[PDB]
Amino acid sequence: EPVSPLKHFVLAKKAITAIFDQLLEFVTEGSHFVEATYKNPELDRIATEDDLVEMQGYKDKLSIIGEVLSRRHMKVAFFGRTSSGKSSVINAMLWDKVLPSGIGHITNCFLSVEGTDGDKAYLMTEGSDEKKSVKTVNQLAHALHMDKDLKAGCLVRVFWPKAKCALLRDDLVLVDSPGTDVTTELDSWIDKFCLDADVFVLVANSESTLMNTEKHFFHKVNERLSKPNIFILNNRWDASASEPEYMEDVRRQHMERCLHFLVEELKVVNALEAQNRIFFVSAKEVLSARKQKAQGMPESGVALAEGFHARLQEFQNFEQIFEECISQSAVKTKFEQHTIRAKQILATVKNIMDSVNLAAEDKRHYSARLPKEIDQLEKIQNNSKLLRNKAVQLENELENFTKQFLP
Amino acid sequence: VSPLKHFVLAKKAITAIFDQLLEFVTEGSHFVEATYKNPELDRIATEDDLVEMQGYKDKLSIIGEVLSRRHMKVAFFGRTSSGKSSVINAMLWDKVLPSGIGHITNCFLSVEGTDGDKAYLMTEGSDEKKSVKTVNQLAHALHMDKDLKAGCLVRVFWPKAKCALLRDDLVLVDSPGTDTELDSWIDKFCLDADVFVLVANSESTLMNTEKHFFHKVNERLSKPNIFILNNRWDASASEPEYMEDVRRQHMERCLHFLVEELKVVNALEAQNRIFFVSAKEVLSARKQKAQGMPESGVALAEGFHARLQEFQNFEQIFEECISQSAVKTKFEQHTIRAKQILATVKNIMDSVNLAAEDKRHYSARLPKEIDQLEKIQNNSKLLRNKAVQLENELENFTKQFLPS
């Protein structure tokens, strides 16, 4: 029963979409009503031109906002020097080899993974919204390899069936980035598809020490952002588990190094909470465990070194902590503004209804005679009352969404 | 048989030559001194001639006991985790160095061959022998040794009967990863070596950090021979789709580095200076064979046999190299110093044989004068002649062990 914390975001996205669809209806049901009280000739000064323009203009806005919402997702970007393991991590999070990840696999560019509803994967390049079909991680690798023309820094969106890993179902986009030791100007290309990530992951190789280039990059990032969500995965941990003599000291030296980094060098986090961003893991091992667990075979011969379970736990710990983290942050970052933008539309749509109801009441009160005419004044006054009562119900739904998902 | 024995052969050949040198020169200085101090001869042998035999006397022991300590040193460099300690160990057939002590500490580490049955540790500054039996006790004691500070090198002594290389007078040296303050530190503490090996991590591209080091070494050095070990090659072979390429590119830059950048070899000999291996596979294959077990569970990736074939071919070529180079670098000057000394000693004798003749010939007084002068001519002649026999077999050494 994996209640993956990403579902908090799937839930919120569902809720704010439901409210916005009701709202599109409410303003179109409303525009149809303001279009009719305006066109009526036996009804003057009741519906103003400054109210008909907004009631059609909101109808336009809300359609486009619905489009923007239906696209929002969670975006996590990975970074680190070449062959640290970035592609091995991602594939392990997806329980299969989605991205290529050998030695010498093309690394010159960004590769994102994200889900499609079909059973056929596919691919997209820059400048072309053609969907280039992609049949397997093998032919994806052999294709990239042959592209000598493939631009440096460019973006390649992979679309992988949501029914292969859960992570892709639950609206999460994962982004692999050019090796941070062979590019020099990666801090320039990050503005295209990575500066707006919710969570960044430094995939540090734990057979080494954190080189300045990796740290220098996150600097230039953290300079432009506001307390970004930075995780460090000292990957390849198994390497040092083959020699227990030094395991305590080796870890304590990395763990002190990463701790001092986030806490003191990046100042993005304090020590107490840093302990839930630095993990020691083995992507190659996690991916081997999973890619076998799905096929049916039991947990046999996956551990290349002793300590495999301790390591797997720490990874599952990372996935847990990270998932929770990205969904809380992204729900706020990507929805709190549309929520505020609806409270304003509602607040003015309904006071348009109040001014329509209020005029029609004062028309029947001081300027009305005909049985046929005053019977229109009552159906306009009742409809405006009914629609304004819809607005208040939507205002409550939004108060409720904000209460559940937006403290 | 091991191509190493050529160094051993020379060592014994020359070291006993220099014995006779200390023998000959002592007898000849005993005779110069007497003829000089003799008050009945005058200027048959000079004060200039006296002091020269005395210096030659006191210097020849020094050069002979320094001489006997000479050996072949091989140095390994490369950034942390590339496989240095692993390469060394594959060449000794055992895990004598531990891996994560280069990761905890930065120190040099040597393995010389002891004639004892149990290994032992020695640091700098002390003459305490910490004895070890298992590698684990070594790996532990290295860890606990608080004195293991930067640049401080520990000699590990490993029984000569446990590996031919240490038996055959070879010393191997690990070193801190070039990932630091090792710029001006290396000097004679590792630039004394005859061959430098560069252990490169195939997972990356050859980085400046390594080149930046060997280029700095190459400036204060002339024509040093260097091998590049592209280690961890199993990681490339696991991914065949990119493997031809990754190997081509590593060849290309390795080739360029030696031939063009470093100007240390030519394009045809560079071929036998670059290798694509997997140290850990070799250490496994050999630590398992050491106990007579068949080979099993050793391959890290398909092609293990080729990586093994390449490490064996590398070892042959390495031993051929450091056997020929080390005889020349460690001995030839001492040969030149020796043939210098003989030519100078044999002219000294002649100079008194002729002073003796020119007395016996142009100033004989009594039979007793004549008797004393003739003794000295035969004495000079007999010494003068043992110099020419030493000159001959000392040349006979060069023709056999310094061909040009």
Ligand SMILES: Nc1nc2c(ncn2[C@@H]2O[C@H](COP(=O)(O)OP(=O)(O)O)[C@@H](O)[C@H]2O)c(=O)[nH]1
């Ligand atoms: N032992 C071990 N090897 C790993 C681990 N993670 C990655 N690798 C290996 O590291 C090499 C580079 O990994 P890769 O996925 O390409 O990292 P990237 O180049 O930055 O994308 C590959 O040969 C993997 O097999 C790990 O946790 N343990």
Ligand SMILES: Nc1nc2c(ncn2[C@@H]2O[C@H](COP(=O)(O)OP(=O)(O)O)[C@@H](O)[C@H]2O)c(=O)[nH]1
């Ligand atoms: N897969 C693989 N691993 C290796 C190879 N050579 C060394 N290693 C591993 O690299 C890690 C660190 O290498 P090490 O031998 O300590 O090199 P050093 O740190 O520079 O002395 C060790 O855990 C080795 O097991 C190889 O050829 N293949």
